[PDB]
Scaffold this active site. Structure first.
Site, PDB file in Angstrom:
ATOM      1  N   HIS A 149       0.806  -1.208   0.000  1.00 56.58           N
ATOM      2  CA  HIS A 149       0.000   0.000   0.000  1.00 56.58           C
ATOM      3  C   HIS A 149       0.847   1.269   0.000  1.00 56.58           C
ATOM      4  CE1 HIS A 149      -4.363  -1.031   0.936  1.00 56.58           C
ATOM      5  NE2 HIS A 149      -3.789  -2.218   0.875  1.00 56.58           N
ATOM      6  N   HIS A 154      -0.922  -0.259 -10.016  1.00 55.13           N
ATOM      7  CA  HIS A 154      -0.888   0.022 -11.454  1.00 55.13           C
ATOM      8  C   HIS A 154      -2.120   0.789 -11.907  1.00 55.13           C
ATOM      9  CE1 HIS A 154       2.435  -2.802 -11.615  1.00 55.13           C
ATOM     10  NE2 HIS A 154       2.562  -2.630 -12.917  1.00 55.13           N
ATOM     11  N   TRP A 204       8.691   5.961  -3.392  1.00 50.02           N
ATOM     12  CA  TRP A 204       9.522   6.170  -2.181  1.00 50.02           C
ATOM     13  C   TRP A 204       8.881   5.494  -0.968  1.00 50.02           C
ATOM     14  CZ3 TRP A 204      14.034   7.422  -3.745  1.00 50.02           C
ATOM     15  CH2 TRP A 204      14.239   8.388  -4.763  1.00 50.02           C
ATOM     16  N   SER A 208       3.323   6.555   2.873  1.00 48.39           N
ATOM     17  CA  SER A 208       2.130   7.006   2.153  1.00 48.39           C
ATOM     18  C   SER A 208       0.843   6.196   2.453  1.00 48.39           C
ATOM     19  CB  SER A 208       2.410   7.111   0.646  1.00 48.39           C
ATOM     20  OG  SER A 208       2.866   5.882   0.115  1.00 48.39           O
ATOM     21  N   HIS A 303      10.655  -2.858   9.125  1.00 46.35           N
ATOM     22  CA  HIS A 303      10.616  -3.773   7.979  1.00 46.35           C
ATOM     23  C   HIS A 303      11.974  -4.453   7.755  1.00 46.35           C
ATOM     24  CE1 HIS A 303       9.169  -5.309   4.100  1.00 46.35           C
ATOM     25  NE2 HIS A 303      10.436  -5.190   3.734  1.00 46.35           N
ATOM     26  N   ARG A 475       1.528  -7.700 -18.640  1.00 48.43           N
ATOM     27  CA  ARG A 475       2.548  -6.698 -18.384  1.00 48.43           C
ATOM     28  C   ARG A 475       3.930  -7.112 -18.918  1.00 48.43           C
ATOM     29  NH1 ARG A 475       0.240  -5.435 -12.272  1.00 48.43           N
ATOM     30  NH2 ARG A 475      -1.740  -4.488 -12.988  1.00 48.43           N
ATOM     31  N   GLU A 591      -0.010  -3.237  27.937  1.00 50.60           N
ATOM     32  CA  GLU A 591      -0.692  -4.274  28.711  1.00 50.60           C
ATOM     33  C   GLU A 591      -0.752  -5.632  27.988  1.00 50.60           C
ATOM     34  OE1 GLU A 591      -2.047  -1.303  27.741  1.00 50.60           O
ATOM     35  OE2 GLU A 591      -2.560  -0.140  29.558  1.00 50.60           O
TER      36      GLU A 591
HETATM   37  C1  HEM Z   1      -7.252  -9.769   2.275  1.00 49.25           C
HETATM   38  C2  HEM Z   1      -6.226  -9.015   1.883  1.00 49.25           C
HETATM   39  C3  HEM Z   1      -5.999  -8.631   0.409  1.00 49.25           C
HETATM   40  C4  HEM Z   1      -6.894  -8.256  -0.523  1.00 49.25           C
HETATM   41  C5  HEM Z   1      -8.442  -8.097  -0.343  1.00 49.25           C
HETATM   42  C6  HEM Z   1      -6.141  -7.993  -1.744  1.00 49.25           C
HETATM   43  C7  HEM Z   1      -6.638  -7.618  -2.970  1.00 49.25           C
HETATM   44  C8  HEM Z   1      -5.974  -7.219  -4.102  1.00 49.25           C
HETATM   45  C9  HEM Z   1      -6.597  -6.760  -5.333  1.00 49.25           C
HETATM   46  C10 HEM Z   1      -8.127  -6.654  -5.576  1.00 49.25           C
HETATM   47  C11 HEM Z   1      -5.618  -6.452  -6.197  1.00 49.25           C
HETATM   48  C12 HEM Z   1      -5.763  -5.886  -7.637  1.00 49.25           C
HETATM   49  C13 HEM Z   1      -5.873  -6.969  -8.699  1.00 49.25           C
HETATM   50  C14 HEM Z   1      -5.800  -6.268 -10.041  1.00 49.25           C
HETATM   51  O1  HEM Z   1      -6.733  -5.490 -10.407  1.00 49.25           O
HETATM   52  O2  HEM Z   1      -4.783  -6.465 -10.768  1.00 49.25           O
HETATM   53  C15 HEM Z   1      -4.348  -6.714  -5.534  1.00 49.25           C
HETATM   54  C16 HEM Z   1      -3.086  -6.524  -6.057  1.00 49.25           C
HETATM   55  C17 HEM Z   1      -1.886  -6.783  -5.423  1.00 49.25           C
HETATM   56  N1  HEM Z   1      -1.685  -7.320  -4.158  1.00 49.25           N
HETATM   57 FE1  HEM Z   1      -3.266  -7.834  -2.837  1.00 49.25          FE
HETATM   58  N2  HEM Z   1      -4.825  -8.246  -1.485  1.00 49.25           N
HETATM   59  C18 HEM Z   1      -4.673  -8.637  -0.186  1.00 49.25           C
HETATM   60  C19 HEM Z   1      -3.478  -8.976   0.438  1.00 49.25           C
HETATM   61  C20 HEM Z   1      -2.203  -8.884  -0.096  1.00 49.25           C
HETATM   62  C21 HEM Z   1      -0.952  -9.345   0.512  1.00 49.25           C
HETATM   63  C22 HEM Z   1      -0.811 -10.047   1.901  1.00 49.25           C
HETATM   64  C23 HEM Z   1       0.043  -9.074  -0.350  1.00 49.25           C
HETATM   65  C24 HEM Z   1       1.530  -9.400  -0.093  1.00 49.25           C
HETATM   66  C25 HEM Z   1       2.505  -8.574  -0.472  1.00 49.25           C
HETATM   67  C26 HEM Z   1      -0.532  -8.435  -1.532  1.00 49.25           C
HETATM   68  C27 HEM Z   1       0.154  -7.994  -2.652  1.00 49.25           C
HETATM   69  C28 HEM Z   1      -0.344  -7.486  -3.841  1.00 49.25           C
HETATM   70  C29 HEM Z   1       0.438  -7.059  -4.994  1.00 49.25           C
HETATM   71  C30 HEM Z   1       1.980  -7.051  -5.197  1.00 49.25           C
HETATM   72  C31 HEM Z   1      -0.589  -6.610  -6.029  1.00 49.25           C
HETATM   73  C32 HEM Z   1      -0.310  -6.057  -7.431  1.00 49.25           C
HETATM   74  C33 HEM Z   1      -0.388  -4.538  -7.343  1.00 49.25           C
HETATM   75  C34 HEM Z   1      -0.164  -3.985  -8.730  1.00 49.25           C
HETATM   76  O3  HEM Z   1      -0.639  -4.628  -9.710  1.00 49.25           O
HETATM   77  O4  HEM Z   1       0.507  -2.926  -8.851  1.00 49.25           O
HETATM   78  N3  HEM Z   1      -1.914  -8.350  -1.330  1.00 49.25           N
HETATM   79  N4  HEM Z   1      -4.601  -7.222  -4.282  1.00 49.25           N
HETATM   80  C1  LIG Z   2      27.128  -7.032   4.081  1.00 48.53           C
HETATM   81  C2  LIG Z   2      26.882  -7.089   2.579  1.00 48.53           C
HETATM   82  C3  LIG Z   2      25.741  -8.016   2.197  1.00 48.53           C
HETATM   83  C4  LIG Z   2      24.475  -7.219   1.939  1.00 48.53           C
HETATM   84  C5  LIG Z   2      23.471  -8.028   1.132  1.00 48.53           C
HETATM   85  C6  LIG Z   2      22.098  -7.339   1.084  1.00 48.53           C
HETATM   86  C7  LIG Z   2      20.981  -8.374   0.949  1.00 48.53           C
HETATM   87  C8  LIG Z   2      19.586  -7.749   0.972  1.00 48.53           C
HETATM   88  C9  LIG Z   2      18.513  -8.831   0.963  1.00 48.53           C
HETATM   89  C10 LIG Z   2      17.121  -8.190   0.865  1.00 48.53           C
HETATM   90  C11 LIG Z   2      16.039  -9.230   1.096  1.00 48.53           C
HETATM   91  C12 LIG Z   2      14.708  -8.486   1.339  1.00 48.53           C
HETATM   92  C13 LIG Z   2      13.545  -9.459   1.272  1.00 48.53           C
HETATM   93  C14 LIG Z   2      12.256  -8.828   1.818  1.00 48.53           C
HETATM   94  C15 LIG Z   2      11.508  -8.118   0.693  1.00 48.53           C
HETATM   95  C16 LIG Z   2      11.838  -6.638   0.558  1.00 48.53           C
HETATM   96  O1  LIG Z   2      12.019  -5.900   1.574  1.00 48.53           O
HETATM   97  O2  LIG Z   2      11.932  -6.122  -0.599  1.00 48.53           O
HETATM   98 CA   LIG Z   3       5.236   5.376  -0.829  1.00 48.01          CA
END
Ligand code: HEM
Ligand SMILES: CCCCCCCCCCCCCCCC(=O)O
Ligand SMILES: [Ca+2]
Ligand SMILES: CCCCCCCCO[C@@H]1O[C@H](CO)[C@@H](O)[C@H](O)[C@H]1O
Ligand SMILES: CCCCCCCCO[C@@H]1O[C@H](CO)[C@@H](O)[C@H](O)[C@H]1O
Ligand SMILES: CCCCCCCCCCCCCCCC(=O)O
Ligand SMILES: [Cl-]
Ligand SMILES: [Cl-]
Length: 610
Positions: A149, A154, A204, A208, A303, A475, A591
């Site tokens: 978020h 996209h 960034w 946000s 994170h 994509r 607590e």
């Molecule tokens: C119940 C919780 C969640 C709901 C309801 C939800 C729902 C959605 C929906 C509706 C989309 C857009 C699909 C599209 O139109 O292409 C989306 C995209 C996405 N979601 Fe989730 N999601 C959930 C949890 C998560 C979690 C745990 C992750 C883990 C990182 C995640 C990562 C992503 C990513 C990377 C995209 C693609 C965004 C993009 O296309 O730029 N979501 N999700």
């Molecule tokens: C001491 C030099 C070694 C440094 C190597 C850096 C390795 C970074 C690994 C990043 C893994 C992150 C996975 C979680 C997902 C994310 O935050 O994008």
């Molecule tokens: Ca941001």
């Protein structure tokens, strides 16, 4: 010798890159990098990172002629993310192109091959539920969506298209067909990549999800007194009359994310209180600016050295993530003497200058694809009583099982309003999240209500698993095997190379045949045999080596302006003394922390014995 698929690129490498490649490849050919002591593991990772920075950062859109400005006049995180990179005022801001990690692969003739519904139904749909044990809880799953978020969404075309389930699987599909919007395609007007897609969130790492993606949203969230953000008297987010949450980015969310947003609103407000105490005469605007800097850095820190360390539960990875934040010289030296040496010794955080490695900062198409982790969400949430008598396990006692489908979207906000912060957070802390494996995709995602930009419900429900597979193809993201080759990883020759699950292999063959080049990225990422302690695939991890480092190293506010002048002395002390989500939850909810949080990390199941 060198794997045949990597011989071509090897032969064209500079001498210094040849050396780095042969070093990493020596381990990879024997699957050894994660089986060696920490120092060699770190050398491996740093070497692989340097190669990725050189070969896997591709600009989308024209790079030259960024808008002219002095960074000294912008010592804060702007509402839309502009004015970070002195050479590119627009880099990382709302409504800019996603970059790429690899040359796109045109799939416009194979968007439905194999059928997305068949993939969803036969490979992804949750069967026997698989979880992470004690390693990673539902708060960890909420956290990563909370980050998405912050990071990426996209832009969509205004028109609609649709997919229909084929007769072979329709009987097993909750939806028989569905409609959705294509990803918006924009001309780059550049010599390189010709078509790009826009990120409608700020790339960034700027908080946000709490603050908003532009000034028009940001203004809606502020009290305009003492720099503060609006929050309800129950410690939950306020809601508009239409049911939509008042927070930074609330689209396609659920109750787990909403509690993290509420928590970090309270965090921001507490930082305002602390700074105003040290500097009595600051305006509302100045306090808001300082508090946003602090809270966004706290989020990035939690994170980096807490969430990621539990995700990748190995000695080498704890050392690696801590080195990115504090440096290999360590926290004591970093906290006492500041940043020393370069990115390795002193860390990415506090580098004297940001570094984009010659390519304007963005998050990438591939970073989106490897973050598709919807299988982390469990089917049900076990609610626990924050003031109950400790049970047979010394856990808080169980109250009732709730279908997590009832906790999603607008109706989820209503249910959260009856449950409250403490019960929701405790319940999520005490339950494992789902594993990123095949056959583990929640049934409620197969008939999901998606939302508009403004958070309101759309009438066309979607099968998310089917849509995700469609999106990667749409994509032009390379499919699994080619994706691996582009990251200098050894490709599979057969299904047996991918996993030893015989049932997985048989199902994959029934759908894809024997063509390993056809295997979808998402299916490969879920199926891939995992490194001991890793919750994610090695393939995804490789994108992250590059991109997680880049989120810190490219940002002025984590580097050249990560100092007391920019954050205030008190603001910088707040960041320096916060080590993980436990510290933030303890601040606002001591607590339940004292009674029930036994694990060192708030991302472990809370009764973990470490
Ligand atoms: C119940 C919780 C969640 C709901 C309801 C939800 C729902 C959605 C929906 C509706 C989309 C857009 C699909 C599209 O139109 O292409 C989306 C995209 C996405 N979601 Fe989730 N999601 C959930 C949890 C998560 C979690 C745990 C992750 C883990 C990182 C995640 C990562 C992503 C990513 C990377 C995209 C693609 C965004 C993009 O296309 O730029 N979501 N999700
Ligand atoms: C001491 C030099 C070694 C440094 C190597 C850096 C390795 C970074 C690994 C990043 C893994 C992150 C996975 C979680 C997902 C994310 O935050 O994008
Ligand atoms: Ca941001
Ligand atoms: C076991 C000890 C062997 C020496 C390791 C050298 C192999 C690494 O190689 C070097 O890696 C650096 C980053 O780590 C890069 O800057 C260099 O370009 C690369 O040549
Ligand atoms: C031979 C054993 C010691 C080798 C360790 C030195 C490797 C450091 O290598 C350096 O790493 C930087 C930051 O990560 C990269 O940007 C640089 O290209 C490289 O100079
Ligand atoms: C006896 C072997 C022990 C292992 C040796 C580890 C020491 C190497 C760490 C120094 C890395 C050099 C840092 C380069 C500049 C920088 O990025 O900070
Ligand atoms: Cl440390
Ligand atoms: Cl710090």
């Amino acid at each position: 010798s060198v794997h045949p698929d990597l011989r071509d690129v090897f032969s064209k490498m500079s001498f210094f890159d040849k050396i780095g490649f042969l070093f990493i490849h020596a381990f990879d050919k024997r699957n050894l990098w994660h089986k060696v002591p920490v120092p060699i593991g770190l050398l491996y990772l740093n070497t692989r990172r340097t190669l990725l920075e050189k070969y896997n950062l591709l600009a989308v859109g024209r790079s030259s002629h960024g808008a002219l400005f002095d960074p000294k006049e912008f010592l804060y995180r702007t509402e839309d993310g502009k004015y970070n990179d002195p050479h590119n005022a627009e880099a990382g801001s709302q409504n800019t192109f996603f970059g790429r990690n690899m040359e796109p692969v045109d799939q416009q003739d194979e968007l439905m091959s194999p059928d997305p519904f068949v993939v969803a139904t036969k490979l992804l749909a949750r069967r026997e539920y698989k979880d992470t044990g004690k390693q990673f809880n539902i708060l960890a799953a909420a956290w990563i969506q909370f980050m998405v978020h912050d990071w990426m969404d996209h832009m969509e075309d205004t028109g609609q298209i649709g997919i229909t389930a084929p007769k072979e699987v329709a009987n097993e599909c909750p939806l028989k067909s569905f409609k959705f919007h294509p990803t918006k395609e924009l001309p780059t007007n550049s010599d390189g990549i010709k078509i790009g897609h826009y990120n409608i969130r700020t790339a960034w790492w700027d908080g946000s999800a709490v603050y908003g993606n532009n000034e028009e949203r940001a203004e809606k969230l502020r009290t305009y007194v003492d720099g503060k953000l609006v929050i309800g008297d129950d410690g939950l987010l306020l809601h508009k009359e239409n049911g939509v949450a008042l927070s930074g980015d609330i689209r396609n969310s659920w109750a787990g994310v909403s509690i993290l947003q509420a928590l970090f609103v309270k965090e921001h407000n507490a930082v305002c209180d602390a700074i105003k105490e040290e500097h009595p005469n600051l305006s509302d605007e100045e306090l808001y600016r300082y508090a946003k800097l602090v809270t966004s850095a706290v989020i990035a820190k939690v994170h980096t050295i807490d969430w990621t360390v539990e995700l990748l539960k190995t000695k080498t990875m704890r050392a690696a993530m801590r080195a990115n934040w504090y440096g290999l010289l360590g926290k004591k030296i970093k906290d006492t003497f500041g940043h020393i040496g370069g990115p390795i010794l002193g860390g990415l955080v506090g580098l004297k200058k940001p570094n984009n490695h010659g390519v304007p900062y963005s998050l990438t198409e591939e970073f989106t694809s490897v973050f598709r982790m919807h299988s982390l969400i469990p089917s049900t949430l076990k609610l626990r009583d924050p003031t109950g008598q400790p049970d047979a396990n010394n856990s808080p006692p169980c109250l009732e099982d709730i279908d997590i489908g009832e906790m999603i979207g607008l109706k989820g906000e209503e249910q959260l309003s009856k449950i409250g912060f403490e019960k929701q957070a405790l319940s999520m802390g005490y339950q494992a999240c789902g594993a990123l494996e095949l056959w583990n995709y929640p049934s409620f995602f197969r008939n999901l209500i998606p939302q508009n930009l403004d958070g309101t419900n759309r009438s066309d429900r979607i099968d998310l698993a089917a849509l995700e597979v469609y999106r990667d193809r749409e994509r032009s993201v390379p499919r699994y095997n080619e994706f691996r080759r582009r990251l200098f990883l050894i490709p599979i020759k057969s299904w047996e190379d991918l996993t030893s699950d015989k049932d997985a292999i048989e199902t994959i063959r029934a759908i894809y045949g024997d063509d390993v080049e056809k295997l979808d990225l998402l299916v490969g990422l879920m199926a891939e045999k995992k490194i001991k302690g890793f919750a994610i695939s090695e393939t995804a991890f490789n994108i992250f080596i590059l991109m997680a480092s880049r989120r810190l190293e490219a940002d002025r506010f984590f580097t050249s302006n990560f100092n007391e002048e920019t954050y205030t002395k008190k603001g910088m002390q707040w960041v320096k003394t916060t080590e993980g989500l436990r510290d933030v939850i303890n601040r606002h909810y001591p607590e339940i922390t004292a009674k029930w949080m036994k694990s060192s990390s708030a991302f472990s199941v809370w009764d973990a014995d470490y």
